[PDB]
Amino acid sequence: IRDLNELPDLNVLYYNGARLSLVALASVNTELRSLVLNMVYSITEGTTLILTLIPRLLALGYVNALLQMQSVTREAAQLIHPEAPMLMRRLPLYEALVAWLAHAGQLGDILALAPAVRVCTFDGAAVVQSGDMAPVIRYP
Amino acid sequence: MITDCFEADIAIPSGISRPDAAALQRCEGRVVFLPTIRRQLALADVAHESFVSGGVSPDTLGLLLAYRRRFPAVITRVLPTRIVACPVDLGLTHAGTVNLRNTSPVDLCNGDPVSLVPPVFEGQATDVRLESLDLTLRFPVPLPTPLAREIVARLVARGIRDLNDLNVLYYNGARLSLVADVQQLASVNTELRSLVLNMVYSITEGTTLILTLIPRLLALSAQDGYVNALLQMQSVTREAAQLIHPEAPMLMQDGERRLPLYEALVAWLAHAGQLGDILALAPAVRVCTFDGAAVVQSGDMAPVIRYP
Amino acid sequence: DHGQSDPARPFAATANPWASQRFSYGDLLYNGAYHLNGASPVLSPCFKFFTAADITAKHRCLERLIVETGSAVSTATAASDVQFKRPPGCRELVEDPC
Amino acid sequence: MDPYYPFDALDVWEHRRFIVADSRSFITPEFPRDFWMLPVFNIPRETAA
Amino acid sequence: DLCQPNAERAGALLLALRHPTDLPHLARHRAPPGRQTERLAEAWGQLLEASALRAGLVSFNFLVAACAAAYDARDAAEAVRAHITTNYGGTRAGARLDRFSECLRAMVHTHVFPHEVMRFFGGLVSWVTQDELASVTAVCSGPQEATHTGHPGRPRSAVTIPACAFVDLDAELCLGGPGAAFLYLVFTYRQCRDQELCCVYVVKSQLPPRGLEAALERLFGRLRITNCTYAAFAELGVMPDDSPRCLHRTERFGAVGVPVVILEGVVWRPGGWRACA
Amino acid sequence: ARHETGGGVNFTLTQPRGNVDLGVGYTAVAATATVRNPVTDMGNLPQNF
Amino acid sequence: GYRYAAAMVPTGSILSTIEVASHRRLFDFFARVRSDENSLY
């Protein structure tokens, strides 16, 4: 996202006291660009349906008092901080939640990265290093 | 076997006319919701009479919400005295291969997960009624999950219109519409509450860094055919940037030691990526036919592997 | 106790004031109790001289003490590059006069 | 005459044994405030003067 | 250092840990602005200097007394603390207790949460100790009661949990219907300015894991108002009985009797964690 | 004890035993004869705190 | 607590039959076994 206008850090990860280098880059930024165009899009049509529906209803019963008290300096401040550099025929406001939930539930299956494999080592090392082989089960 | 299967047994009552007995043997692989994981139950606990609330029958949008408070079990063999069913939530079989049945008008592909849905379609609400026992049975409909995410997305969105068409789908070139029906306003308020809690929690201080990049997108969807095919004809961001020029706060509170965008993505996945599972129920089942084909057609059995 | 003689060489109380006495210069550094250099992996040889906890702990049986100082467990390691305090896991039986 | 507050109200669940970060509340009587009279000090009939 | 398979008998939970040197760097980034990033680097640094008086292990009964200052009856939360300072291998484990709980109270403040570190390891079947270390054997998947314990004189082992962490949900909601019962680990968080508590609970229920967070809204919405994650749970295993069976005895951990809930016939199936911001 | 890994199958064998030392008083002596390579170079390496 | 190996050869037999849990107060050591427990062996 930061190449689409980076950071001093975020090229560095630590795991098991060991350093990772995500840089090792011009191909990678072209490679993963289609996730970026879907992650940028799914938030922008996400956070503009909220911004166009909370001022639409503020439903009066208990949903009104529960929301803005929980959105007190959390979203109601963030609404007017967005609506400072924003604003408030017929807009197709209800036909887009269908198109948004279908897209947002589509990336949830992708970016979940479900584990297919668990590791129950027996008579061996608790840590399997790079290049070595690890015993693999997933069923009890 | 106790850990491998778990053969939950619905007992059939005594007085059954042989037509109503021959109806249940036609329900070999169906989906049956259990309230507990007892090994001894009765059809009265399964059927629609156990499903109805106090005084009020639930509509289709509430019929989802009392599925996810139960245990989906697949019938495996209908004996003359009882019904054997295996719950999905524990573990499917020894070898892990259960035969379902497409009650849907929609075929499946291999590797499609299977989310199940009430009889929402038109000309489809088929309830096997046992007149000798006075029991109807709502057998739900297995679907490929991008239909089951869109079918639940049509029912919530129609419910907000009644707080002040949409009922037409397409899937593999087949036009299919679902039943337009009156909705209980008590049930729609639960779905309405689950949006506002889950969408606001996905908003973080890093999201306003992202909303500055909206005029980049409309500058970019005029160049890529990919992004021009991405936004939509019916998008909102194309309208909320031609009226709106956003800008960010230029410096952040301790913005160097912490990552403002990275926490926005993680918070977004935990609330908006999850959101398709919060409204509907989970796809705990997929299709891996061994040697037949890529596609199991409608009305035909499909083998099943456990699926997270 | 520096109001007393020295069991080794009784006619004096100590060879150094700067070391012997509690809160001397030395004990401030090398008492494992104060836990000063505990960070660094490098062995500190004198750690067993100034550490008050150890000596007070050991029993006084001579029949017993002998048998153990054949099997005593070294504080150092022989796989070290420079020299190291022993990793918590490993053990080497090394007979200690000291 | 309503005192100023930043927040309206909230709905929170609290278990008995697991209470953490304890707090306290405020007490109002059980009779209607029409029976809770305005404060009065009787000035004595005469002054030491 | 931290766990003792010697003092704790066969049939307790075990919780594995990550590597400890990633802790002082990840606190510098995940912390919200206005909190002390250099608290976890010094609180953990005074436990390596307290346990010397490396992905190790922490057993379950050791962890109860550290979070004992945030449990209500508190009579049996102090009974857990009684047998730890007197029976665990290590000089002043109670000094480690007020340090490892200070490590735990440094977890929540520095935003590196303790549920992201604790990993379920199996239940105790046998353990072989030595100087400074032990070879712990466990059951990462399967039932409990029929394991080759190692001693063919006693090839049995039952699961024991102290009564401050054991929370039913069938009696509290009048759910008297029989059926198979599930087991869950539950953490509670409490984010306040230098008033932070920890609690470890082991919840038994007949509920689906999809139908669990509503119950965490019901009991643990109290800390939700003060807190935006407030709970973090994980599956533990299944009681396969149509009538799940519990017992309530006071076993003797050395010379101290602690009220211990006995679970019977547990089939271990692990799972993952969950956040609820 | 049969516990399979790596596609293989492991057989671990164990023979439990016991030892009592039935001598009273010292029954064994260990004398040190010679000296091989002194391991640590006897150097001058100062310490850094 | 109770020696089973002596039960394989009883001294005499109990001729009266009553649900025993009622009189639990009367006994030093008492146990109910549903079918079989793994301790017997």
Curated annotation (Swiss-Prot), chain B:
Q: What is its main location?
A: virion
Question: Where does the record place it?
Answer: Virion; Host nucleus
MF annotations from Gene Ontology:
structural molecule activity
CC terms in the record's Gene Ontology section: host cell nucleus; viral capsid
Query: Keyword annotations for this protein?
Result: Capsid protein, Host nucleus, Virion
The record's Pfam families line, in alphabetical order, gives: Herpes_V23 (PF01802)
Asked if Transmembrane helix is a keyword of the record, the answer is: no
The protein's matches in InterPro entries, at most eight in alphabetical order, are given as:
Herpes_capsid_2
Q: How does it assemble?
A: Interacts with TRX1 and major capisd protein/MCP.
Q: Which family does it belong to?
A: Belongs to the herpesviridae TRX2 protein family.
Function (record text): Structural component of the T=16 icosahedral capsid. The capsid is composed of pentamers and hexamers of major capsid protein/MCP, which are linked together by heterotrimers called triplexes. These triplexes are formed by a single molecule of triplex protein 1/TRX1 and two copies of triplex protein 2/TRX2. Additionally, TRX1 is required for efficient transport of TRX2 to the nucleus, which is the site of capsid assembly.
What name does UniProt use for this protein?
Answer: Triplex capsid protein 2
